[PDB]
From a paper:
BAIs are a family of adhesion-GPCRs comprising BAI1, BAI2 and BAI3 that are implicated in multiple developmental functions. However, how BAI3 engages one of its ligands, the C1q-like proteins (C1qls), remains largely unexplored. C1qls are thought to form large 18-meric assemblies, suggesting a higher oligomeric state of the complex and a potentially different interaction mode.
We then determined the structure of the mouse C1ql3-BAI3 NTD complex by single-particle cryoEM to a resolution of 2.8 Å. At the core of the complex, three globular C1q-like domains form a trimeric quaternary structure with four Ca2+-ions bound at the trimeric symmetry axis consistent with structures of the isolated C1q-like domain11. Three BAI3 NTDs bind to the C1ql3 trimer. Each BAI3 NTD interacts with the C1ql3 trimer at a composite interface between two C1ql3 molecules, creating a heterohexamer. Within the C1ql3-BAI3 interface, one C1ql3 copy establishes a Ca2+-mediated interaction with the BAI3 NTD. Asp180 and Asp232 of the C1q-like domain direct the coordination of the Ca2+-ion, while Lys66 and Asp63 of the BAI3 NTD participate in the water-mediated coordination of the Ca2+-ion. Furthermore, C1ql3 Trp188, BAI3 Lys66, and BAI3 Tyr67 engage in a π-stacking interaction that further stabilizes the complex. The second C1q-like domain in the binding interface also forms extensive interactions with the BAI3 NTD, where C1ql3 Tyr244 and Asn242 engage in hydrogen bonds with BAI3 Asp63, while C1ql3 Asn240 forms a hydrogen bond with BAI3 Glu60. In summary, each BAI3 molecule forms a Ca2+-mediated interface with the C1q-like domains of C1ql3 that is characterized by extensive intermolecular interactions and spans a total of ~564 Å2. Superposition of the BAI3 NTD onto the C1r CUB domain highlights a conserved core of β strands, with the primary distinction being that the BAI3 NTD contains additional α helices outside the core β sheet that are not usually present in CUB domains and that may mediate additional, as yet unidentified interactions by the NTD.
Residue numbers in the entry:
A (entry chain C), B (entry chain A), C (entry chain B): 4 to 107, 125 to 152, 163 to 173
D (entry chain E), E (entry chain H), F (entry chain I): 6 to 137
The structure:
Amino acid sequence: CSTLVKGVIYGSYSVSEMFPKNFTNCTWTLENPDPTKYSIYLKFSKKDLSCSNFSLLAYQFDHFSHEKIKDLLRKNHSIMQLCSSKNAFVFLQYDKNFIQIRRVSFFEFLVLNKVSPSQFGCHVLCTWLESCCGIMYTKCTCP
Amino acid sequence: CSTLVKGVIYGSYSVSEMFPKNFTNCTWTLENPDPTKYSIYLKFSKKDLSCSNFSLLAYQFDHFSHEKIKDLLRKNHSIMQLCSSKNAFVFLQYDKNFIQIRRVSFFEFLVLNKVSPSQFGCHVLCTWLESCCGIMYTKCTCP
Amino acid sequence: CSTLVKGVIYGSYSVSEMFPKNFTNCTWTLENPDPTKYSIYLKFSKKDLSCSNFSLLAYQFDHFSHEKIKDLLRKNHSIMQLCSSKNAFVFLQYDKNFIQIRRVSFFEFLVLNKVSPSQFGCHVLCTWLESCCGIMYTKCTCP
Amino acid sequence: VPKIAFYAGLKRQHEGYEVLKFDDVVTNLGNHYDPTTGKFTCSIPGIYFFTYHVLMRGGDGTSMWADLCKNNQVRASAIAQDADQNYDYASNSVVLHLEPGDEVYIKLDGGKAHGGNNNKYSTFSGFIIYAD
Amino acid sequence: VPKIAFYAGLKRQHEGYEVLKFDDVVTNLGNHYDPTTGKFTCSIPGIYFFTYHVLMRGGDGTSMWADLCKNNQVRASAIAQDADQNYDYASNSVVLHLEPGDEVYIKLDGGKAHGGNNNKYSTFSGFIIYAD
Amino acid sequence: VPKIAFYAGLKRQHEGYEVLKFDDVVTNLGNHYDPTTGKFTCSIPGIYFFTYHVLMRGGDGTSMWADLCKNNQVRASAIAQDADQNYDYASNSVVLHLEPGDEVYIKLDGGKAHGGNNNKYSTFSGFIIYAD
Ligand SMILES: [Ca+2]
Ligand SMILES: [Ca+2]
Ligand SMILES: [Ca+2]
Ligand SMILES: [Ca+2]
Ligand SMILES: [Ca+2]
Ligand SMILES: [Ca+2]
Ligand SMILES: [Ca+2]
């Protein structure tokens, strides 16, 4: 159970859409087209997200390797706990080749251009600036 | 009517010499041998320069194209107006591939080495330091 | 009379060992494996070293050329005088391709890694930190 | 044997996401490179080697991507980056297989190149190694 | 007569002193390059040309050495360095003579390389020019 | 195809507007490269490919120009620049047409090249592709 959304500047996915399988063990992946050029910003909505019988693991990596994912999970020192996040909205930045969210209420990402952000890209991020609180923002400035 | 002085570290030209044609529409050009290495400094003298029936346009570009010159002229937001310069001496720096002066009292230029200026080059520029006033001077220092 | 100790991270040489020839005119050389990567640190012990009838010249160069050594000696503006050193221990740094000590009580050197010093390399240098006094030390820190 | 080999410097400055047109053609053996468009159009199928050196313009722009694009796919990527805005190269070399019509070209992917005039700082070299 | 020529990008990032395994093979004529090990094993003795471009990993690591090693000896060395931690290439190019079994490969000698998936920023190119 | 191909590293440090003498000769097929002078003298006319990588010295020197000069004219220019005085390569590749007697060589046009001893950081590669 592994689907990867390869080419998208932006994308809004519901929990049901990103995991359209009855089996609770599935991985949803987002490939960064070019980490030299783009930085992927993730946004998590907990307005209707629930974790009664589901675990939300947010992490990044560089290459497809099951042993790598297992070792990262066993590390358990920097993996994001979406369910155990105090703030309603979770903002994450992932400047690495791959982003994968696995399953063990929607969320939107943004493949922003690192040095020359597009008009739409910086507009979406300026809307995410409504965090509230420490956040990561880029060079492009918007009120 | 287009003459270009290609290889010269230094050069002194009178208004008559740089435009040796009866027709008032002529262009005088100075090619920078290597903009990675050299920065061309221009010097303008208004001691006997007159613009009763002549227009002095000072500008720069990168490639020979009449359309480019026309578009630059229609821009007219940063083109130097030698005739309408309050100061007697006009000092200009042009770190671009080409320098062209067109006609619609002399002037001297200097193809200085940007990082390792020669003994003669930094000497000529040190004499041009007698502007008076805002000037652009290079790394090499001289009393 | 020229021996060169090519491959050694560390090396302890006595005056007799580095010059095992009856002739008083001999050169002992130490080739830096990679100056882009390594910086050679020298250490001189004057506990039993004597210069009653011997001259200790410490210098560096880039390529094997007798004329280069002669010109450097005739320069005599930065060549180290081991015999005429007030402090008992002499610490020298040589970030150049070759190090040669010529003869006209031991000494130890260290081919340290410039950017990623090894565990042993930084340990040896931390022991040399016991100069006493101005010394040259690298990024790696040790009490 | 087929003799295809070219080399051309970059006479004019480029910027943005435009195909680099290396007009300073030193060699165009076979006339398989077109400086007006800047594309090397294969005609004899075979395995070609292309190298490109693209000087990032100094002074403005701290990053420049020059991707050797084959047809509509990026077959190599080069990034010239310098936080102090120096003259760093975005160079790379490829050994691609080409069929007739395959237009191999260097396309800027978000930076300003350097116009060397006749200096030939930024270049585009390439030759056929074997013919299929 | 013999057609040996390869080109491969660096799909996975590397670090330290490990042989670079360019697993993004675009050309592998003769199948004389092995992405699993990352070594071009000569089979037909002759004079070969190899070029490698290895992008230093941006962000972390101010220096990176990528030496084209022939068997157990460094036939070329390239250093990518940037005090501001930019993307600089440790590229170099060699024309080596090779006997059968000579494994030519690019081996990091410090610093971290960049893994570009299918981008092919960091490449390893090489072909046989002559055979004995 | 007559076999002309060479590759040599920079054993000795260089500085200023002097021809680079790559004395660390690895390949000198045909003995058409002379490390004592540092010039590749063509003998059989034809289309040649030359690439040079010239590491500039770390420490002293902020910019270094290494132009592949063909006889008395600059057939390519490379600038290695780093405001932080790092190591950067002034590399470039050319595909030049050469007549007998033409002397292709890399001449520094400012700055100091790095003397890599046997490391072969700064290199000069080149081979004949076609014999006219
Ligand atoms: Ca790209
Ligand atoms: Ca090495
Ligand atoms: Ca570079
Ligand atoms: Ca030049
Ligand atoms: Ca750089
Ligand atoms: Ca820099
Ligand atoms: Ca800096």
